Amino acid sequence: RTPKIQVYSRHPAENGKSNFLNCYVSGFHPSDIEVDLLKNGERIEKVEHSDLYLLYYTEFTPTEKDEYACRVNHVTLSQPKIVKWDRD
Amino acid sequence: GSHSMRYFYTAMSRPGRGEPRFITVGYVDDTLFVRFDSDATSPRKEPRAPWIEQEGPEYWDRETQISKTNTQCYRENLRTALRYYNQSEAGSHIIQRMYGCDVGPDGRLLRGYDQYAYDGKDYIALNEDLSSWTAADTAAQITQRKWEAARVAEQDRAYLEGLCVESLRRYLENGKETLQRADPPKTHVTHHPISDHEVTLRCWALGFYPAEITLTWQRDGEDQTQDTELVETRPAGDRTFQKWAAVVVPSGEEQRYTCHVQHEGLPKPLTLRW
Amino acid sequence: GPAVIECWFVEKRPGALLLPPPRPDLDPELYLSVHDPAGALQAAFRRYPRGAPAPHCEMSRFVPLPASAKWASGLTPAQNCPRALDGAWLMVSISSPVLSLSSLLRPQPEPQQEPVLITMATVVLTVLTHTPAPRVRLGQDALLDLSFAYMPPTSEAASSLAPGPPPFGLEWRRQHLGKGHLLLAATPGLNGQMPAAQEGAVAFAAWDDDEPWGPWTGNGTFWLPRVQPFQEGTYLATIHLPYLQGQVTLELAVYKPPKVSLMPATLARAAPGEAPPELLCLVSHFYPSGGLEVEWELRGGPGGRSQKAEGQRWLSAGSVSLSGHLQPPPVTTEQHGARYACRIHHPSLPASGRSAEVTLE
């Protein structure tokens, strides 16, 4: 099973203010999966997971040139998968 | 009521990150009463539900040793699969298994599920009469010939004729606050944006335990399947089986379409619009 | 069909079947020249696409295991193995998108051959289907092909007070992916209790003739009534004889094409020097979510139909009815009444995937 990975927000994103960045991964086995986040290609800290597949989330301040991404590494993935930042 | 008890195994190869991982859980009703993980500091059958915690320690330690025995045996099974499946050790392929007992309203056994699955595709299964097998293709045919010269069918038949019945009745005694084990789904509807002019609507049904559930859509009273996405029953990963059916429809006709669930956990083919 | 059929052996070991060139390294007990009294295997690989790529072959051994079904009591009214069924038993299973084969053989102890070093076998049970993957239309009955052949024991004839072709059984186990059950199980020619009929399906299963001592070929074509995509998937067809049984696999899928939706479809003006509104792109059924490609293109200016569009885009990924979004940039003096296009590549769709458009001003 390959995971479904939707990278969205909590509110319509604007430039200059803060918002949520939420990587929703679901539908696969096992429970442990290497789900990380990138800022400009660099592995960020602060990435949440749900309680006892489900939503991962964090907060940020979207800007103009800065770029985020969600890195996913599941055992079916021979190599990780980089889901790009998406606002609209 | 018609009850069911399920144990779930899941083996997988993971080269470069160690050895093939193995995971096991146990479900009565929608209640997870025991977990397991080979990637644990102490891969013990751990307590989860506040009613299984009163069982004899012999059960716990025996099931934990059974978990490790199945870890070894299904690592060997992953090996023998990878050997004559024309696949590489640089990749990783997952195998899963679900086995348990289904009983009627009086606790009398209906039958026993014991089905595998390989890389999402189904593998092999045991029939209701417990005297035949159902395979998928040439290699699953090899495994069916192996276990047809080895009667796992009659094994599980005489097993559920003694062990699963006692265990399920004892677990019913551990919690009489629910008489629902053959899980009906837990449903809702997702909206997906096509802006002001149209919408995508998905009727989701998750949480349940079986797999054969006839999910249909009806316009007014007309069955319209040409525009619907009825993807296969994909579990969640926490052993709460899921499914949904969607449509990109214009912003208007969505009301004419109604979701329909045929299942035996649900007392009837219920109509849905959430 | 092809001249030789190379094959593997486990329960790996390479081997071959011949329906000869020198083969010294292959085990003389693993290279088989097949004898065919009934011509089923021979004239069935004759009416076979010769030159087709290597199908899926597998060889193994077998011992006459009676059917565990209690209704099968009647074909085996005595728990003794026949005398003419001694020696070795080989079972060969072949699969291809044209025909599926399951054959039983009884070779010889010594592979010594005076001409060229090769081995002789003989087919006692042949099973061949020419419908390995039907595709029936929703709301119509389904027919399935399945032929077999049983050669009598060439020796045992001076003791059988009941000569002629004995009865046989046909069993189709079917459908309900995520579970399993049995649809057909009948041994025509025996006054015995037959099981019930699920859904009401039957099969034409009998002999083609009634010649008493020669070989025998039999028909066993399955027939299901009005089908429904809740029966799609896989099924298994087995032919049974006293102590003997041979099974093959069949698959079935249904076809339903998708339709498009692209909003905003038609709009009004958008003053020059202004970014057009949030445009969207959605698809109906496409599953799962691996290998999906998303493209956003400006179609209404210079640069052909393959430009990295300006402005902001939006992709994403128990499946997906994806909703791609797009915020185009302000317009220039070259994109009056222009258009924007979105392209989705998914393995289930054609190599072009699915395109949608949105008109601007």
Author numbering:
A (entry chain B): 3 to 54, 63 to 98
B (entry chain A): 1 to 274
C (entry chain D): 1 to 11, 20 to 27, 34 to 331, 338 to 381
Which passages does the manuscript contain on this structure?
Loading of MHC-I molecules with peptide by the catalytic chaperone tapasin in the peptide loading complex plays a critical role in antigen presentation and immune recognition. Tapasin, a key component of the PLC, is a 48 kDa transmembrane glycoprotein that bridges the TAP transporter and MHC-I to facilitate peptide loading. Mechanistic insight has been hampered by the lack of detailed structural information concerning tapasin–MHC-I. We present here crystal structures of human tapasin complexed with the MHC-I molecule HLA-B*44:05, and with each of two anti-tapasin antibodies. Movements of the membrane proximal Ig-like domains of tapasin, HLA-B*44:05, and β2-microglobulin accompany the transition to a peptide-receptive state. Together this ensemble of crystal structures provides insights into a distinct mechanism of tapasin-mediated peptide exchange.
Here, we describe a crystal structure of a tapasin–HLA-B*44:05–β2m complex (determined at 3.1 Å resolution) as well as structures of tapasin complexed with Fab fragments of two well-characterized monoclonal antibodies. Tapasin binds to a broad surface of the external aspect of B44:05 including the α2-1 helix, the α3 domain, and β2m. The interface buries an area of 2494 Å2, of which 1984 Å2 is contributed by the MHC-I heavy chain and 510 Å2 by β2m. The tapasin N–IgV domain forms a glove-like surface that addresses the MHC-I platform and cradles the α2-1 helix and supporting β7 and β8 strands and connecting loops. Several tapasin loops interact with the MHC-I platform: that bounded by residues Glu11 and Lys20, of which amino acids 12 to 19 are not visualized in electron density; a long strand/loop that extends from residues Glu72 to Lys84; and the hairpin loop from Gln189 to His195. The second B44:05-binding loop of tapasin, Glu72 to Lys84, a structural feature unique to tapasin and absent in TAPBPR, interacts with the α2-1 helix (including side chains Gln141, Arg145, and Glu148) of B44:05. The third major tapasin loop, Gln189 to His195, protrudes beneath the β-sheet floor of the peptide binding groove to contact platform strands β6 and β7, also directing His190 towards Glu212 of the B44:05 α3 domain. In addition to these major interactions involving tapasin’s N–IgV domain, the IgC domain engages the membrane proximal domains of MHC-I through contacts with 16 residues of the α3 domain and 8 of β2m. This extensive interaction with β2m is of particular interest as it may weaken the β2m-dependent scaffolding of the peptide binding domain floor and prevent the well-documented cooperativity between peptide and β2m binding. The tapasin-stabilized peptide-receptive state of HLA-B*44:05 is characterized by distortion of the peptide binding groove and destabilization of the β2-microglobulin interaction, leading to release of peptide.
